[PDB]
Amino acid sequence: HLKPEMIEKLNEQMNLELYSSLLYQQMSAWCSYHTFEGAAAFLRRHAQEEMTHMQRLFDYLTDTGNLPRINTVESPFAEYSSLDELFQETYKLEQLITQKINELAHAAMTNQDYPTFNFLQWYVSEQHEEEKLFKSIIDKLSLAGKSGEGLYFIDKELSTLDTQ
Amino acid sequence: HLKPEMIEKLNEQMNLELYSSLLYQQMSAWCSYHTFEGAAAFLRRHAQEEMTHMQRLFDYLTDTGNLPRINTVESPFAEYSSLDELFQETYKLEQLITQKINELAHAAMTNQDYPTFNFLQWYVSEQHEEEKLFKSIIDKLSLAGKSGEGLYFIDKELSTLDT
Amino acid sequence: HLKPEMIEKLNEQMNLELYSSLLYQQMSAWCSYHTFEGAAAFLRRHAQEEMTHMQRLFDYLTDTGNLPRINTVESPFAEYSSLDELFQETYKLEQLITQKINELAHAAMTNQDYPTFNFLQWYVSEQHEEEKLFKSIIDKLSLAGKSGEGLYFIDKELSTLDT
Amino acid sequence: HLKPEMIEKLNEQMNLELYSSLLYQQMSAWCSYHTFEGAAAFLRRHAQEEMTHMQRLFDYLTDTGNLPRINTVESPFAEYSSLDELFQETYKLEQLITQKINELAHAAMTNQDYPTFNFLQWYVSEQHEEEKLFKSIIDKLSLAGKSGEGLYFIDKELSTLDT
Amino acid sequence: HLKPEMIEKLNEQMNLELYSSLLYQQMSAWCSYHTFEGAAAFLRRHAQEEMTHMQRLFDYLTDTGNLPRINTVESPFAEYSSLDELFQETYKLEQLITQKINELAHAAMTNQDYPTFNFLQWYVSEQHEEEKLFKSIIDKLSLAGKSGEGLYFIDKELSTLDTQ
Amino acid sequence: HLKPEMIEKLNEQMNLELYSSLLYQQMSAWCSYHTFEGAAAFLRRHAQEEMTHMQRLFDYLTDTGNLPRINTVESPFAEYSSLDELFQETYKLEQLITQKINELAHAAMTNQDYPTFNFLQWYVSEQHEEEKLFKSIIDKLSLAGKSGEGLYFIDKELSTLDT
Amino acid sequence: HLKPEMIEKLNEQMNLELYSSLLYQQMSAWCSYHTFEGAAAFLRRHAQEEMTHMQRLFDYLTDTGNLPRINTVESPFAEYSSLDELFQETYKLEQLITQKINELAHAAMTNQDYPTFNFLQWYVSEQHEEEKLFKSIIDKLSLAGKSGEGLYFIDKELSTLDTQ
């Protein structure tokens, strides 16, 4: 009893959360391969977090009598020139996700779908936290990332970052 | 480190496990949509388990100096005519995984890759457990799955199976 | 404080929740009378839950300087041809409540009543949970409700459902 | 010590108990193969119990200065047309054991072997409990065993019966 | 989905483990009859251990969709001239069992049956332990077994041997 | 018992592990003398670890009715130009140890010595972990090892690494 | 600091303790091969003890600014005609160690090396314990070691000797 438009938008965001999980997972291999073991462990944990975001959309869709649908997932494989460029990409992905959540909420308002607007609030709030988390990592690299010694400590901080 | 043939079969297996995870995820949606909430909960738990099979291959690739590559995943989306057909498919999928693992083990032997052969034993053993679990569900469905009532109870058992 | 239109839709919703409580109470009598004691126990618990939905609207009206008014309640008394028809009706009632809440939320927006919009989110969220609970009971009845035996078991599940 | 006739009937009974253990073991294989995993688990536990009946006769023979002799055991392998036929056979086997014990008790009396008569009371009493357990399983199968669904539930009960 | 050859080999080893249980049980009567109560108790416990080896093959066969089959079991009855000869026989039985496990593993390799090769590893490892256990008993008898006083202490050590 | 070839390769690997222990021990002195006390502590702990590797082979040889032989061990003493060079040598040594273990596993398979192949699995698995550990130290030195300050921290991390 | 003479005698002594470790280890295999498993265990534990005596010297040398040096270690492999003869050899070795420690102590006095004389007191005291331990084993053997039965008991004792 959601409108088809909203069902699909929700469904697409579910797929986006899935992609993001796999992108973070893939990025963790780049890190491991380039010796950034602590950044690898943060990314792997973050990948798992994103699956949780996926499952939550998946559950909203099944609970409203819909059939979520996992679409083709493009390969997340990429090359990065530095640890710094990899985290620039994570931050831009999180900004895209934020923007798609804003579009979903706007569409929910325009369609007068108050259940979905309310459901989305969890994501509005989480994306705020995500952008702070990923911006703080860029800010660390900016400040201390210009030597191997600096990278070595940031890598250590990443090994346990956000496990409060 | 490892031979090109081994790296490639490992990487392909890691992708098959990822696919399996998503297929179980997708099937649990089919189950919720058709009111089998227990089966859905079991499929969802099992999706997560398959992800850990993926990760263990991912971590062996990275630990051996290689860069695991998550390839494009085909949509797991499908139609099933019955819960029974859906679990037939899970069992076939698990027999395919069993077979690819055995092929990987045999490649390891013939390439004299003892570290890989040893790594794979975890999968040989897990696949023995996977096939019993999925076959036993099919057996439940053969025995008691021909009425709503039976499905009802099987669905309930599935809601806590293997927990 | 609040606009006349908002006070009135709130007050009407408070009365709909009261009615819902009594209707569930009345249905639990139909269930006891027809030997479905489990369904009766579940309906009785749910009647109490609906009363708390009533009270929360009552308390928001009073907290905003208004005097909530319990209007005459129509008799919830009715005949049902089956336990299945009875639960069809509970689900329709819950979809009607969902719809009135969404109308109330929309009125809140268009009146730029942000305190009321915020108060209503508790109901939007509760109604999402109500519809799943009632739909799942209907699904149980579709699957296993066509024999005495199935009803027996469904009745037993209902006796502890959502506790 | 004991008379030749007593030593021999004891030794034969010890072999019948061994055979019974293996027959229950073998039946549990038939049950697993046909998907009755609960019945299989119960048969397997019961096989172990029959082994302890064997051992107690073994230990009485040795304690009385005799050398117990495990004779050749016939293959317990067989085909059954149904789980019901299989449990019919367990019950017949248990009635045969009951009868051989009673013959042994009577031989003990007529040989004025009071130590043996006293030793055998453990078996008289155990056989009373064995026949109730096996008869009750047959009764479950008569009552609810005519559908997949019933078998399903009976199988589940068997998985924890007498534990 | 195991090959018939492997199913039968597994099945035969199951029967061998069963025989061995009954042989140990039978040997314990010889011991009791000849007053070696402690050796009797070790043998009875070992007989139970061998049944466990049987059940494990039995379970692998049922779990792979096969029907294990208990065959005719020959009588284990024998005469022994001494406690020492009885333990020579236990050691040779364990060497036979070891060899049949090696043949089963070789056949598994040749057939490319990696599940069965992996299953058999438990037995490769156990048989290593078994041969040490039974060799140590022969070594005790060799060293201290030549008098009744010696036999009396070895019999006492046997009464609680391998119950760690 | 085992074949002469297997006995000899096992004995030679026992000796290689012993040598490795003493090399780590000697390298720890180089590190102490050049003020890398944390590196020295890690190397001392690892020398003890390699001693356990030696023992497990010694014990397999004795348990199989053989007589292990500790051969003459050449002095492990050497000059290192840097801490980075020393750790490059430890990694090369672990690679050699891994390769010998793989040649031993191979010889076991082709001699059909399944007991030894099984025994060697512990080493296959251990050498996988040894290589990850020693490669990670060289990776730390590569990232952070180019200033006294960086060496200072790596040395700290090494003082408790892998405990 | 440390005079050359002292550094050398200390390093030699480190190497003798390393040799003694390996000799005890090699002797345990002899015991194992001849079925004296309790003796083998004792010697394996004692080879570990000697290694700690090696390490304590190693650390004294490094702590005084020297570079201890592990020299070539000659094969400890030997034939022993009996368990008794093997323990006669361990006793003689321990007397040699005692004597080398006393020569080191004397060298430390002659050279006015009070730090080293102090360091060596651990060894003086230890070697007094070592000699009692290995003498007591020979004394068990001369008393009860002339029958297989006697040997079986001493072997049992050896299996847990010196463990608290």
From Swiss-Prot, chains A, E, G:
Top-level class of the enzyme under EC nomenclature: oxidoreductase
InterPro entries named in the record: Ferritin, Ferritin-like, Ferritin-like_diiron, Ferritin-like_SF, Ferritin_DPS_dom, Ferritin_prok
Consequence when changing residue 17 to A: Initially 100-fold slower Fe(2+) oxidation rate
Localization, UniProt: Cytoplasm
Record-level GO BP terms: cellular response to iron ion; DNA damage response; intracellular iron ion homeostasis; iron ion transport; response to oxidative stress
Phenotype when changing residue 53 to A: Initially 6000-fold slower Fe(2+) oxidation rate
Pfam families per the UniProt record, alphabetical: Ferritin (PF00210)
GO CC annotations, alphabetized: cytoplasm; cytosol
Residue ranges constituting the Ferritin-like diiron domain according to the UniProt record: 2-145
This protein's UniProt keywords: Cytoplasm, Iron, Iron storage, Metal-binding, Oxidoreductase
Effect seen on changing residue 126 to A: Initially reduces Fe(2+)/O(2) stoichiometry from ~3 to ~2
Catalytic activity: 4 Fe(2+) + O2 + 6 H2O = 4 iron(III) oxide-hydroxide + 12 H(+)
Binding-site residues for Fe cation 3, renumbered to this chain: 49, 126, 130
Coiled coil, from the record: none
Annotated EC: 1.16.3.2
Chain positions recorded as Fe cation 2 binding sites: 50, 94, 127, 130
NCBIfam families, alphabetized: PRK10304.1
Biological function: Iron-storage protein.
Family recorded in the similarity comment: Belongs to the ferritin family. Prokaryotic subfamily.
Protein name: Bacterial non-heme ferritin
Organism listed in the record: Escherichia coli (strain K12)
